[PDB]
Amino acid sequence: PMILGYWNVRGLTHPIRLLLEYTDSSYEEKRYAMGDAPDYDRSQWLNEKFKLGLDFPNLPYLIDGSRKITQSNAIMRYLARKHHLCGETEEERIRADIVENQVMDNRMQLIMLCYNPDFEKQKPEFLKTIPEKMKLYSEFLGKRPWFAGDKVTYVDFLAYDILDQYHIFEPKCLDAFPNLKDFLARFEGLKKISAYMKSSRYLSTPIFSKLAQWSNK
Ligand X SMILES: N[C@@H](CCC(=O)N[C@@H](CS)C(=O)NCC(=O)O)C(=O)O
Site residues, ligand X (CB under 6 A): 11-12, 45, 49, 58-60, 71-73, 101, 105
Which of 46, 74, 176, 211 touches a second copy (CB under 8 A)?
A: 74
Q: Examine residue 94 and tell whether it contacts a second copy (CB under 8 A).
A: yes
AA letter at 97: D
The reply to whether 69 sits near a second copy by the rule CB under 8 A is: yes
Phi, psi of 63, rounded to the nearest 5 degrees: -110, 125
**Residue 150 binds a second copy (CB under 8 A):** no
Q: Which is nearer to ligand X, 179 or 215 (CB)?
A: 215
Give CA 185 to chain center in angstroms.
17
Q: Is 202 labelled as part of a ligand binding site?
A: no
Please tell me whether 199 is known to bind a ligand: no
8 is annotated as contributing to ligand binding: no
**Separation between Cα atoms, residue 15 and residue 77, nearest integer Å:** 11
Instruction: Give the nearest distance from C-beta 194 to a second copy in angstroms.
Output: 30
Binding-site positions for glutathione: 6-7, 42-45, 49, 58-59, 71-72
Binding-site positions: 6-7, 42-45, 49, 58-59, 71-72, 115
Binding-site positions for substrate: 115
